[model samples]
Target: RRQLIRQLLERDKTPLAILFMAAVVGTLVGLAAVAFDKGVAWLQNQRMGALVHTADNYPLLLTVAFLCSAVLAMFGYFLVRKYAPEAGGSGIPEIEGALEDQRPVRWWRVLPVKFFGGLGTLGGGMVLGREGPTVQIGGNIGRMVLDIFRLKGDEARHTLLATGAAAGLAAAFNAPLAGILFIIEEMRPQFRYTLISIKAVFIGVIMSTIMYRIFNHEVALIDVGKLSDAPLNTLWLYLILGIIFGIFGPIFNKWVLGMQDLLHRVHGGNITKWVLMGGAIGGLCGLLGFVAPATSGGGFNLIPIATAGNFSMGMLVFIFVARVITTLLCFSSGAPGGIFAPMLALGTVLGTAFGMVAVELFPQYHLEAGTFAIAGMGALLAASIRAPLTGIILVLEMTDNYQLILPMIITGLGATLLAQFTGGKPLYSAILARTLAKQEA
Candidate 1:
């Protein structure tokens, strides 16, 4: 088929052939990611919305919600434990391993396991994000296309895998340039950039973004509305927010990875025990959702509200604490979800809290807490993930707040600097390192 396609082509194999394929891969991944995105939103709605009658009783509503979410969460946990354990976690590190040329891509197992299992946890109102599965599924689909098309050289394989992953990330957030930046920045060591490969990635991101706009809309993925400006005197406040996250960022990663170790010991190499534990945590998410509405799900739905400063400073802090705990439990338990959304939500909450306090103290500056919310949104990412540029641009594009780039960068710098000073490794890289150690051992 490769030769047949070559023969059919006006010329033999060239960069052009691969370039043409990039569009197809991008468009295909775009379809899948948005499908996943919409699927998650729909499931969340059903889970949250279907409690019409029970909601009136409050007590019955809580019980029903818990049981229903527990069932579905257990279903999700079991599938990942049995079918594709690799699909667990945010699924980003798996792709990072693949790009490093060591980890294999098991497309046949991963696509179905992550797609449906990911949906399972989410539909039950679990505190996880769709981006993790979207990225993994996207990479798997790329591999599937290559395998079915009878393969190309290493470049073809490598380029498409990266393209598909980037496409999915871009599509999910509706941020094409940020998606491209993520690949180039986050995968800095693994991604071998060249004219051919970069162009393919660009095509993938561009095409998938077009597909996202078609299916969804050309707007902010987190849509905090038009942002207002904060006076220059308020710039330091943004850095303080980043510094808080810088400290918070490393601690957050520490607890998450620490929890992973604890869960590993608790699971004791048994899938049943492991999944039941996941179900327990999943149940808590459902239970907690009712008690504190802002602390559950992927946290995307709550970001706009939190960033909008709808809650008091102390209220935002409580939500932040609650979510930090939720994120620790759900994210560490081998759940198929992304940390990005959860972290973003956390950043917004803490930043808004800081901004609220700052506004009260320095009424002379005419500061708006919302601006700090956006800055904090990116701060946690840069500091915790060790991808400062990716964190900054991701927020920059996803929120469409160009006016805050300076603050965004400043916040990222503070967080990352402190995170680095504390000798914290980048989150995903550490996860990948752990996976590799297990592989050989």
Candidate 2:
């Protein structure tokens, strides 16, 4: 029996061990995502629930909310600064760096720091997404599994890392197709596409998605509920909207990078200052959550509300601008979170606002702003990430609005074209470049 097992393992026809490990990584990442989601929700409820009850005690409630969020954000900052500096910020760049062998995968430190540290930052009600942390965590888990199994070959190790990343994304958004495409599109240059690696990714994504459904059930992450389809005549409007985002995309990327530089100057590698800065931002976000709930947190809750036209055109623009500031501040401040959700929210606002105006001008078309919202949801992602296919599919899966595919593709392609024309670099690649330059210096 032992000899047969050894022979089976040694055979080149099937890398069963790698496939099995991929499944394990997917399951683990899926569970981690669930735990992280639950953790954030629980903490937010605990912090905000008490504040809600104390609404009459305005001053006291405000003070407590600010302090609680400040402390939580500080905890996250301290963990990253003190334990694993690489875990700071969105963390996607670090994973990209790792995939290219440009960075080390210190899974031993990253997993704990990201999981608990993310709990603090995300729980603090900052404008951030769980997807970044999940992706990083997933990749780290892959490396950890690789070491445990004593996988020495490059292909084995790389395939698992990619698998974990895909699984993490799948688990986070419950979009298995997006997870696979993310690796294939966004991580294209780094991921060595082979039969084994592709199969491993599929296995990981499937397992993680299954695990996510087991915990959260099968539902769209952002359920806008069957928005109207874009008319063929109105497709031009989407192209125009995409052009607007194309112009905005590069500017947004510049602002993100600039803010990072500004924060770096402010902290100047001082852990104490960094933590204090994070606390200030987190406290401000907490205050904003009470004052204007729509403009705070990861923006997941805001998506459906914003798309439902709960806010007027003017108000949508107001929230969009406000979130842009908050997103830039929280994300660029080196907080352990992602800008993906916030960007999606911002895009929805802009698109919906545009749709409202288009409706006013062209009543004959009878346009649905929600459709525009769905299309614009992926535009910025496509432009910033330079992965239009992934962005389109991700938004499609998240909203379950397959009918908007044409508009999505049009908007995404237009954004990508204009962004490239403006000499805009992919967000993650730019970040990794900066990190490499700093490391070399």
Candidate 3:
């Protein structure tokens, strides 16, 4: 007993041990996240490319698109159904729940399930994003490391989970500081906020960022170019945008939960019903891909186009309505996907549309619609996640538009404050509550 006590006390004799291990964890999680992303991208490109490349010979692009999407989506569905149902949707809320001891981590099941399953589902052209899965997997990696290293302390567990989460975000967007800020803002309730924890988060972020830079060559996630800054005089336009989001944010949240409940009632936990919903959504998106492509699937590909000011205000409004329907339909079905990317897309559409109208009405201001695009890019996230700092920092990091930081902050803050005033709860928190309530029942 005395020797065991001595060993435990001597384990981390120096502060350097904590820093070094944090760095190591960050590096590993970052590489994992980056490699996962590349793997998914490669699969998607290869599959879709082969179909398009052989279109002349096959003359079956439509059938192949549907089949490929269905097959890939089925693989994701089976894995989630058979292994880790908690891996559905954004896993960030699960991570938050785990930290609060409100949910089990189940890393052994979730890690592989989410990673491979996400690749299949997302690569299948379903409307989803990687940020959520990456963050969840990253946290799992942290827990795995702790278990493997025999770091049997609550502090160690908490630190590593936080570290992995930060590293994951860093790798996802190549945005180290934003990753740290995400922990500070979105996971504030769980973060211990100690000096050691903060230092560990920083170390993890730096290591993960280094790995991301190495693999990605230090490029911004979204290179929309430098946009015009929002003048103080035109700030009211942003306030108006925030007001619009405030009204829509809660309504959107309500629809999301309502759709989930409605689907649950219709399906009654039957696997076939769930899988059929996935197939229907996937097939519809595939068809839409050839028709109104702008309104279907994840929004990553449409962001640059939407922000480039190619569409008139009327076109933007149409696209926004179309996408809102598609997003709600796809996400509410619970198809092993994420809404983060889709929400970003929504914000961009409305923001740029608003900016276009502003430019027309106040042509004297010489305004740029793209600035509103940037501000709007993060506004939905701010309103939905109630994490304005993370949203603002993530947008700035993704776009590398540091000059527009003030506007980003103002818009994010405005959105967050307005959403709160309207009694809108954070999306992830609400999801967690629902999950817990179900578990209790």
Candidate 4:
């Protein structure tokens, strides 16, 4: 009787240990994400606030734009080149490699590099997503926890790392199901399925989201207010919008990859040329912000503005066109950030633009621009990443336009289908493939 009791206790107690550790992992990533978010925002505010308060001195405003952002941006370029080249870009692809036992996390080198490097580039007019930094940092933190605890087995370690990543995304976006679906859809290739694994994911996700709300204190990221549901007849327009994203999305992917090659050619492994290139691009982005501030930064808040139908169709297209280039350079450079926010904002911009035009074309239908804007918001991600469910869920959760569920899925399906037909690779996979190709070369 005594032996049986003790045996049962061992099974229950030891298993809980992993769950307990996941909690800690979630808590740490939650705090870390908040710190990273706050840190970047503070830097962004300081960079713009200290110098530009309408210094409109024309000559000097332009001069300071270049001078300030160049210095700030170079810090990221130099650090990534010097400390850990692996830290560049979103670092999402690197995690996939580690999950497959092909790449190393090298946490000590990467943890700080991703954090500070992202702040530098993202802080200085470079279009980088907050999600990338958190996800990267969160993955590293899980590795840190594992090493510290001397956790047994690759099984547990892998789960924790994945948990950290999910938590990071959950914290950053404030969307729980989207994070869960992300791991399921995006990271499924390597995510081992088991009872404990999922429970660990839950522990991490819940705890991190808990911590996120403790500090951030918000549910939805985009408060575009309530939008009306479109009539079934008008839903066809969303399919057309999806077709445009479908056609345009693959082309965008080509530009992204081509730009990636161009960045390589410019530096050709020389750190100085790379840093100067980043500085110049970063400076130009800052100056561009002086002319059109909306095109600058990651533009999370900009989503609501786009969905709010604040701009004319022409202006929306201009913003979309402007941002496409802004991101092409910054993202192609493999800066320490993700294009997640950039893509989402652009999707919304184009969707809103399309909606406006449709309103004019079918004046009788009385189409609501916000509804289509919300639909368009999810297409680029689905096309680029090929995670249709994730794209749909993320859009629904973020925008709270649950009324457009069918529309969201339609766009995602169309985008992914066309991307597949066009031989477009998932953005993360494409970038990772290139990185590995170069690594071997």
Candidate 5:
């Protein structure tokens, strides 16, 4: 009877097991990612609440904010350097490397370090986003579960990790479709696209979105209100804007790598020096928060501001230049951050600048600056990441401006095509390549 029962149970095993496990992974990833966001937001609010009374004393408060931010950032950098050097920067590169089997998935060390370390670095006002860290943490959680379950084989390893990442992104943005598209678009090279894998991604994203909605509600992150659609006549303008981004994309990638090399030389594996440099970058971000607040941090808050068409053309250009410098500095300096938000900010700044100029030059078209804002929303991402579909869908999901989907697609395609023509590779892939080289070294 025992032998018969064991045979029956083993024979009854179905694909449902995979789906069931995926659901659990999705729920956990969602909870962890959202909790990470809340923790960071709470810290940011605390700092702001304290600053309300103290910031009036500019020098003293700035000094305090800077120092506080610096210390917090130092804690994060120190943790990464000491515990898991692989957890530094976005960690998305590391995740990609793991997916390709080119690097180890040291989730035992990475999950905690990235979660807590990201909280410190991002909450300390460093120019970073929660998405990258959350993605890495989520991927680690997948490995953790598999290890605990004693699951083996490459298929199980890769699928669960991908599902976790999709879930994490969905939780981060409250956009399930975008999350699924991220895997399809960004990780195309590494992910094994199969019916089962895609279904797993879909299920994972759905549950993650549900969890995110529990905390953040259903409101779009950037509510620019309903904007006018772009006319065919204005299509050429989007193409032009895309072309501009295409040129800038490779240059931006080069700068990111160049800055990373520069910082590597400056620090030379010294933890103290790395931490101090991170602190300095964080302190500068704090100072910029007081002076030109639009040019620092993750740049999410600045999106609506720039897209609102309040800034003059010259002022928009100035802010764009400033943010470009600061974004390059904070990210390339090895701060635990993601370039996604900063790239969005850069796109907005340049898009708005372009829109302002176009409005002045072509008053006959009755073109809405907001349209350009929406187009710019995806252009830089398309150009830099070379993921047009992901960029368009992500913006659509984040802004809930589905009416602009066609224009978004066109702009994204244009940006991507031009970027490729100009010899720009995908940003995350490039980062992974660099990490691999360092690993080999």
Candidate 6:
């Protein structure tokens, strides 16, 4: 038995070893995501509890909220600035760079920085998602495992990295298919997909998703409930909605990059100034959460509410615009956070708003506004990330709205077509390019 085990371990090209490592990576990433989620919830609860005790003293509550959030955000900023600069932002780009060998996989630095730093920024009530950090952490863990096992083969290393990333995404959203599709669709260019690698990815996603379900139970992340399906005739509206997002997609990407540049210029590599600005932004988000909770945090809670048509068209637009600003500020500030959830929130708002208007315009069609909302949910992601399959499947998995597949595909294609026409690059790739440029400079 020992000789067989040694033989298996020594065979660097063995698929079994890669699959075993993938499973390990998946389990670890799943646990990490769970811990990160709980950590953020605990921090938020503690802060809110403290504020609740001072509920009578509105002034004191406000001051404390701002200060607490500021401090949390500052902690994250300091960690990134002092220890691991690459740990900042959505982190998906860094993983992509790593897979392509364009960036180093400094797992030792990234794991701790992204984990605790994400805890601070995300806990501070900033508009960010766990998916990005989870994915980054997952990839780093894969590399870490590779180092620990002394895996020297390129196939083993690459397969594990992709597997970990997929598993991380699965654990974060509890959407295994989306996790698989993300690597196949989004990381296609970077990932070297072999029979073994693909199998490893599937194994990783399966293990991670199983672990996630064990912890959280089998439930949809967004939970919009059984929304009405989109009719074939109503599919045109989805295409139109997609076109609208197509126009916004390039513009949004440009703004995101521009904001990064502006913030970079403003801080001028000064850690003190950079942290101060992040704190101010965080403070503002905390204050906003007090007044308008819809516009703050990762925006996950807002999705079902918005999709339920709880808000009027006017209110939806207001929240949409407000979140857009908050999302831009928090993400572009280089906080250890993600734009994924916030962008989903934005898509829901805009989609639902469009649906409401479509109802008013084409009452003859007897359309369900929620269908449009579902279609719009993935449109922006498709357009911006240029990953139509991943976006469509992700929203579908999150909402369990498989009935609207036709409209979703139409919307996704329209968005992708127009976004490509407008010359918008993938958001992560653009960010990675910018990061590389800065490194060279």
lDDT of 1 by residue, 400-422 (tens): 88888888888889999989888
Candidate 5 lDDT over 1-441, as tens digits, reads 999999788762326656777788889898998889988888777767767868578788888778777888888898889999888887777777777877777889988888889888888877787878878888888778878887666656777888888888888877788778887767534545433267876787888778888888856677787888777787888888888888898888888889988888888989999999888888787777766778777788878877888777777888888988888888788777677777887887788788887888899889878778888887888998777887788888877778777777777788888889989889889999877787779
Off by over 4 Å in 2: 1-14, 190-196, 218-220
Q: How accurate is candidate 4 locally (lDDT)?
A: 0.82
In the range 322-341, model 3's lDDT, one tens digit per residue, is: 88887777777776666877
- lDDT of each residue in 176-246, candidate 2, tens digit only: 99999988877645545443378888899998888889889854568898888778998999899899999
Give the distance in Å from residue 285's predicted Cα in candidate 6 to where it truly belongs. 1.5
Q: How accurate locally is residue 47 in candidate 5, as Cα lDDT from 0 to 100?
A: 67
Encode model 4's per-residue lDDT on 149-186: one tens digit a residue: 98887667778888888898888888877777787788
Quality of model 6 by C-alpha lDDT: 0.86
- Per-model TM-score, in order, reads 0.93, 0.95, 0.91, 0.93, 0.94, 0.95
Ranking by TM-score: 2, 6, 5, 4, 1, 3
Q: Whose TM-score is higher: candidate 1's or candidate 6's?
A: 6
- What pairs collide in candidate 6? none
In order, candidate lDDTs are: 0.82, 0.87, 0.78, 0.82, 0.80, 0.86
Ranking by lDDT: 2, 6, 4, 1, 5, 3
State residue 55's C-alpha deviation in candidate 2, in Å.
2.4
Q: Give the TM-score of candidate 5.
A: 0.94
- Error of model 6, residue 417, in angstroms: 0.7
RMSD of each: 4.9, 4.5, 4.5, 4.0, 4.9, 4.7
Q: In terms of TM-score, how similar is model 3 to the real structure?
A: 0.91
Best by lDDT: 2
